[PDB]
Each structure stands twice: as structure tokens, then as C-alpha cells.
Amino acid sequence: AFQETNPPAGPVRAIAEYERSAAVLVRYPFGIPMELIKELAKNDKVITIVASESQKNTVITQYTQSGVNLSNCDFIIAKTDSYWTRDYTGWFAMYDTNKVGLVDFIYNRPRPNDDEFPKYEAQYLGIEMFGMKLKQTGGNYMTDGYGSAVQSHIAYTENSSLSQAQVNQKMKDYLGITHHDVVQDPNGEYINHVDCWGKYLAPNKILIRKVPDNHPQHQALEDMAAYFAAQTCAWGTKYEVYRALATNEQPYTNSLILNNRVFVPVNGPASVDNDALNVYKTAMPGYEIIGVKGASGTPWLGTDALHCRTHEVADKGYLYIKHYPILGEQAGPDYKIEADVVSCANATISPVQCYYRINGSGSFKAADMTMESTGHYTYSFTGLNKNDKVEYYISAADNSGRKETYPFIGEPDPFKFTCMNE
Numbered sequence: 001a002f003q004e005t006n007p008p009a010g011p012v013r014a015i016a017e018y019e020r021s022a023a024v025l026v027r028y029p030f031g032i033p034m035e036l037i038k039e040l041a042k043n044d045k046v047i048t049i050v051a052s053e054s055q056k057n058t059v060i061t062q063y064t065q066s067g068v069n070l071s072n073c074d075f076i077i078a079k080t081d082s083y084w085t086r087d088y089t090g091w092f093a094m095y096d097t098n099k100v101g102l103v104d105f106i107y108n109r110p111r112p113n114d115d116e117f118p119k120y121e122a123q124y125l126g127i128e129m130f131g132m133k134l135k136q137t138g139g140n141y142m143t144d145g146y147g148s149a150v151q152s153h154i155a156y157t158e159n160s161s162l163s164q165a166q167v168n169q170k171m172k173d174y175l176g177i178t179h180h181d182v183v184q185d186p187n188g189e190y191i192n193h194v195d196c197w198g199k200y201l202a203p204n205k206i207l208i209r210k211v212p213d214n215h216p217q218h219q220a221l222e223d224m225a226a227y228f229a230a231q232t233c234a235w236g237t238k239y240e241v242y243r244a245l246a247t248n249e250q251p252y253t254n255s256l257i258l259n260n261r262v263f264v265p266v267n268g269p270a271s272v273d274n275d276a277l278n279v280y281k282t283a284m285p286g287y288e289i290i291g292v293k294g295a296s297g298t299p300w301l302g303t304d305a306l307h308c309r310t311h312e313v314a315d316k317g318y319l320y321i322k323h324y325p326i327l328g329e330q331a332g333p334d335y336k337i338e339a340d341v342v343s344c345a346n347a348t349i350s351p352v353q354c355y356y357r358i359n360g361s362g363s364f365k366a367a368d369m370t371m372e373s374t375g376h377y378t379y380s381f382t383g384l385n386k387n388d389k390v391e392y393y394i395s396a397a398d399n400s401g402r403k404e405t406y407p408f409i410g411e412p413d414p415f416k417f418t419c420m421n422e
């Protein structure tokens, strides 16, 4: 039976895919090209699931043949049914102020070895695991990191003995989801996973598939894009909605955000791939976008591509910056920013800075933020005149060697506001 547990001690907050990742999880026998594993292992830790010591040795030889950086490769020995690590591996959440935990669930497939796998993931990472008794799949889940999550309708229809209030309450208790947005899938295919048509790229940005006017799903996808563009996001502005045109069922929304890199599956034509990559680059300033060709033996599909066959792994020692930015026209008369910073590594934080620029003058300048109370840092912009333009971002570091900015990418994409008070 599924191992349901109590939920984590609160407050709880699900970690978004665009927050720091300490690794990426993949599985052998493989469903991804070796070129992707090589690109991943250049800068990130790759954890490969294998069934035995013998399969570990087989994978090390294949990685060596392909020129993969073995110093960034680790293994978990566990039986698995499939390579869809997106769908059956555990979900990450912060809880109890400064801890990172794993959330297990009932995988919505008759794949009992995949379903059992999250306990091995939590044991490898040395983190606690909580069992949320819902039939779920990670491909059908995404969070903004501020309490919202989007899922297709199967989150309710595959949990039909529970009311929507009961399903919503489990997402609140185990993942800190205060808005569980369960929508009718707009894609007209069997899988009903959000990652085949939608992807948060930041707390204020969402990518939505677009198809030609006469495609049968055209209006459902336009309605979905208009729904996000019409509502407020976690940063108080309306969502920025970006569109990836699939002229022929290319899975352009099925990308992986891993730290400052974005891996986008491409399967042509080349000009249409370039257009899709340039949407990601436009939406995500400062990120490095990589178009990834599929493996010939396990190609990318419209309903199953790169995001489906990977899962980011959160940092157990995450240096977490919580910030609601000051954006756009600001009435004033005060312009005060606040950021909460917590070290899940239990390391002393020093320094916490605001990097800023006024009216585009010179370079960004750092100012130390004031620690008002443990983990709560503030900064007031002084001497600002009407119509002054401010660019800023947050930086923090701790004694474990971690360094983080808010927004994630830092200086390439600062927050901006205009002073309106005289």
C-alpha cells in the first residue's frame, strides 16, 4: 500500500523548477541522448537510477565513451519500470522554516517500482519524505514557488473519491499550495500533462503552446494564454505570457530549467526551432538556452520529451531568498524593499546586499541590507526624485559557500520601478 504520512511541519512552500537545483535525476535504460547527459554533467550533478551494481558499471562505461564528466555523476540503486523520472520521482518543498523535504504520492500508472522509488531519493539526499495520498504525476505539476500550482483536470478526475476541497487541502498541507489551479487540459491528447502545453518560466512568466489557426486546439490554447495574461501573478503584476508555436506538434514547452540553463527539445524544422529558442531567450534574459536533439532510438514526442525524462533535485542546504519586488510605477513616498533569507545549510549568512542603479548611471552599486529581525532584511531607496528610474536585485551568500540572487539570474534581469512621488 501507499505509505501515507502526516504532512510536514509548517509553514510549507513548494520549490519551483527555476529555483536552485543541486542535481538532475535520470534513469537507465535510457530515454535521453548521451549528448544531453554530457551537457548536463558539464556544470551540474547528474544522478542516474540503475537497478544494480552491474548496471552502474555499464552506465559508467557508456558515459566514459561519450566524454561525460564522471566527477559530476552519481548513482542510486533501485528497481524502476521506466525512464519518466519527471512523473514518479518525489516533489520538493521547504518546511519547518529551514528544511527541504521530499513529497511522495501515488504514481498514476501501474508501475510499482517507479511508484516506490521516492524513498531511495530521500535516503540518497538525507532528507525527510512525506506521503501525500493523492494519485499524481510530476509531468502534470508545476509550482510558481509562491503557493500556486497548475495541473490538468486529471488531478481531480484520478482522485474522484475525494472532493475538490479535500484534494486542494492535501496540496496545501503537503506542498503549501494556496492556489491549486486545476484546469481542463487544452491539448486534446491522452496524457493530460501540463508540461505538454504550459510552463512557468519565472513567478511572473508563463509559456503557453500556440498552434496554427485551423488546428483543432487553437482556441483552447488561446483561451488558456488569455486566462493567464488577465490575472495577477505572485509579484503583483499580471503574468507575462509567452507563446511557443508548434507548427507540427513539436514539444517546445517540454523543457528543463536547471539553474541558469534551459534545455529545450528540438525536432525541426530548423527555423521553427530557432523561433522557439528565441522565445525562451527573450522570456529568460541571462539564461543559457540549449536546443537538444532527441536520441534516435527514443525520440522526442509531442506528448513526451525532455522535461518528461528528467527531474531537477532541490538543494538540501538551499540558501533561500523570499522577495516580493517593487515594480513599475511607485507612488511612494517611501521605496522600501524587504527580503527574507534562510540558510537550509544552517550556515551564517553574510552579506545580504541590494545591488542597484539609478537613472542608468554607471554600474550597479552594492548596499548592505539591514537585518531587522533574524532572516528579515530591508533596504530603503533614499534621495529619489519624481521620474527617477531604479534597477535593483538582491544578493546573499553564506558560510557554506552558497551564493544566490533574486531574481535567480541576478544582474542580467533586474527588477525595475519608477518613482512617482514629488
Ligand SMILES: NC(=O)CC[C@H](N)C(=O)O
Pocket (backbone or CB within 6 Å): 084, 086, 087, 109, 139, 191, 193, 303, 304, 305, 308, 309
Ligand atoms: N511524461 C511522459 O511523457 C509519460 C509518457 C508515458 N508513455 C506515459 O503515458 O506514462
Ligand SMILES: [Cl-]
Pocket (backbone or CB within 6 Å): 158, 159, 160, 161
Ligand atoms: Cl478511485
Ligand code: NA
Pocket (backbone or CB within 6 Å): 088, 104, 105, 106, 107, 114, 115, 116, 117, 118
Ligand atoms: Na510514489
